Amino acid sequence: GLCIAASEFYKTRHNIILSAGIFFVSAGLSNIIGIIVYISANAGDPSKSDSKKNSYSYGWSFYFGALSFIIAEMVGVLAVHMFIDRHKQLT
């Protein structure tokens, strides 16, 4: 993405931005899954009727991962749009 924002580069015109954009999205997607997967598991932990309030505290880190992952995704999206615009300009 850094090489694709003008340079000094790339020398992969646009194409690079599209690739970079997907990678950020995938990165975000992976992050969303990992956080969720980890999260899903703890909530189920039946223990067992008078908890969950109660029970534990949870995330925590999750929250951050919940925010960080989201942020990452957003960034990826932005990158993708940038590449798209670049592509448009070339055409």
Partner: protein, 49 residues
Amino acid sequence: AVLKLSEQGLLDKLKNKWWYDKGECGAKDSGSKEKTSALSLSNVAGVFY
């Protein structure tokens, strides 16, 4: 005496007294008193993947 006690249902009575009556777990009562609800992301998660 044993035969007399059984016919008077006294034996069956004694068993009920120490097995079920002297119990802390009404089986049909524990199922009649098991209220709840809540949700479970579990099932919904499978549709996310």
